[PDB]
Structure formats: structure tokens, C-alpha cells
């Protein structure tokens, strides 16, 4: 089915065109709040902003802006929060967002250092005995354990609100070898990572939406979410071969600009869904 549709696109070589078409048709919505001058230093990139209508609001009287978007797939019945790699000044906001939205998992698809440049702040503690305190938002963050594998790491974190002294376990799924504007090592590597995120229960509706980020939070994040949603739909529907990837991607881009950043990432998302389908049957 989709494999046939996949065979065709590859032969013609129209991936760059199929991709450029999705870009032409992608929704365009105002980003007034993100562009306010008082928020310049809360954005990592000037060409990547959350739409006003889908943005996450911090529950803070001071300034409620964070560069994060709620992506609500109503048919697949799954929500995601896509956001940028936190800045040195927005780490408190990031974890406040995680607390307020009752998220159970955080999916990170970039590395803190890429090509000698800092694409992301060290927003979680690297050592069990060096916990992080965020003074502005009154949150404490402790590394509980980590399990390192060749291409991804799974960390267990404890998030505590210093005001209430509630504590929550946050799972941190970190794909460590996915380069900006590139693709994972293989469909199998991606599918194993996604299936571990799934098996943890972090995408279950009993929790708030999982937080997914990269450096900008659109390219690698879109590849991850597109594949996860398409596989969800194929299980739900009585006609699995029906699911149209480009329609799902365009539905996702109503909530955040730029999801999936290269034609190869788009191609890779098809591959991951095709290969991933064999496990769902």
C-alpha cells in the first residue's frame, strides 16, 4: 500500500517537491506574543516561533511566554508539546511548563553541543549529587538514575515544587546521535527509541502531553511526532493502508510552523511508518 506510494516517490525523486509542496500549503498564523520585544531573549531563533493560538502559557503573572506549542491530534487522540532547547535563562520556565502541564516524559532529540556551538542549555543535572535549583520558579530537579545505550540514554528525574513539596518522577528520553537536519541511524534505531518512549506510559492520556524538543523543536521533533501519530492512526482505523502521511503532517503544521525541516526527514518519516507497521499487525 504505502510501500507502493513510497516506491513511486523515490523513483521520480520528487521528495524535494512533495516537501516543497507541504511547505507552500502549510498554515500561516500570527505570532504576535512571541515577537513582542520583551520576549526576544526568550526565543533561541528569530525564524522559529509558536503560533499565538497554540502556544503554551506559563501560569505566572509576570510574563507567560515560552517558545512552546500544544500539538493536539484529535483523531489519533494524542497531544505533544513541542518546544525549543531551553536557553540559560528559560530553564526555569521549561520545568515550570513541565510541572503545570502535568507532563510525565521529556523527549530530547538534539545534543547540548553540536559542531562546537551550544544548541541547548544543560537543563538537567549530570550528577546525582549535584541537583539543580531554579530560584525564579521555585523548582528543584534531581538526577535519580540514567541508563546509557549506544545511541540513546534514558534518565530518571525527580521534579519537586519547593513551594508545595510535591514530587514527580520525570522520564527523560534522549536520542543522542540524531544530527540537526539529518536523520536517525536507521528506521530500526528510531522505532526502538519510540517504542521505549511508548512502553514507559509517557504518551498515555492519563498524563499531560509529553514534551518533545530539539534545538528549534520543529525538524527532528516533527519527524518523531509525525511517525508516532501515523502509527497511532493505523492501529485505530479499520483501513490501515489509508493513512496519508502528508495530510497528517499538514494537520500538525496547523499547530507549529516548520515541523520536519528537510526532504530527507520527510522521506525518513515514511520509512519509519512503513517499517513500524510490521510490528503493529
Amino acid at each position: 500500500e504505502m510501500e507502493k506510494e513510497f516506491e513511486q516517490i523515490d523513483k521520480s525523486g520528487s521528495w524535494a517537491a512533495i516537501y516543497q509542496d507541504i511547505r507552500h500549503e502549510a498554515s500561516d498564523f500570527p505570532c504576535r506574543v512571541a515577537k513582542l520585544p520583551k520576549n526576544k531573549n526568550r526565543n533561541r531563533y528569530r525564524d522559529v516561533s509558536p503560533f499565538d493560538h497554540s502556544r503554551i502559557k506559563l501560569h505566572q503573572e509576570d510574563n507567560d511566554y515560552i517558545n512552546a506549542s500544544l500539538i493536539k491530534m484529535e483523531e489519533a487522540q494524542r497531544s505533544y508539546i513541542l518546544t525549543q532547547g531551553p536557553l540559560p535563562n528559560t530553564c526555569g520556565h521549561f520545568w515550570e511548563m513541565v510541572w503545570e502541564q502535568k507532563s510525565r516524559g521529556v523527549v530530547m532529540l538534539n545534543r547540548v553541543m553540536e559542531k562546537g556551538s551550544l544548541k541547548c542549555a544543560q537543563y538537567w543535572p549530570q550528577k546525582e549529587e549535584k541537583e539543580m535549583i531554579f530560584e525564579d520558579t521555585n523548582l528543584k530537579l534531581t538526577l535519580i538514575s540514567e541508563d546509557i545505550k549506544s545511541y540513546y540514554t534514558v534518565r530518571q528525574l525527580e521534579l519537586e515544587n519547593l513551594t508545595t513539596q510535591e514530587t514527580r518522577e520525570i522520564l527523560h528520553f534522549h536520542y543522542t546521535t540524531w544530527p540537526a537536519f539529518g536523520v536517525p541511524e536507521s528506521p530500526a534505531s528510531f522505532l526502538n527509541f519510540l517504542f521505549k518512549v511508548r512502553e514507559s506510559g509517557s504518551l498515555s492520556p492519563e498524563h499531560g502531553p509529553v514534551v518533545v524538543h530539539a534545538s528549534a523543536g520543529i525538524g527532528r521533533s516533527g519527524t518523531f511526532c509525525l511517525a508516532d501519530t501515523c502509527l497511532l492512526l493505523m492501529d485505530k482505523r479499520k483501513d490501515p493502508s489509508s493513512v496519508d502521511i502528508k495530510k497528517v503532517l499538514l494537520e500538525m503544521r496547523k499547530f507549529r510552523m516548520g515541523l520536519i525541516a528537510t526532504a530527507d526527514q520527510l522521506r525518513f518519516s515514511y520509512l519509519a511508518v512503513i517499517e513500524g507497521a510490521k510490528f503493529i499487525m
Binding site: 533561541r44 531563533y45 528569530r46 525564524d47 522559529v48 534545538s215 528549534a216 520543529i218 525541516a261
Partner: peptide
């Protein structure tokens, strides 16, 4: 200061 290019 921009993601693209």
C-alpha cells in the same frame, strides 16, 4: 541566531 541555513 536563525535555525535555517
Amino acid at each position: 541566531k536563525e535555525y535555517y541555513k
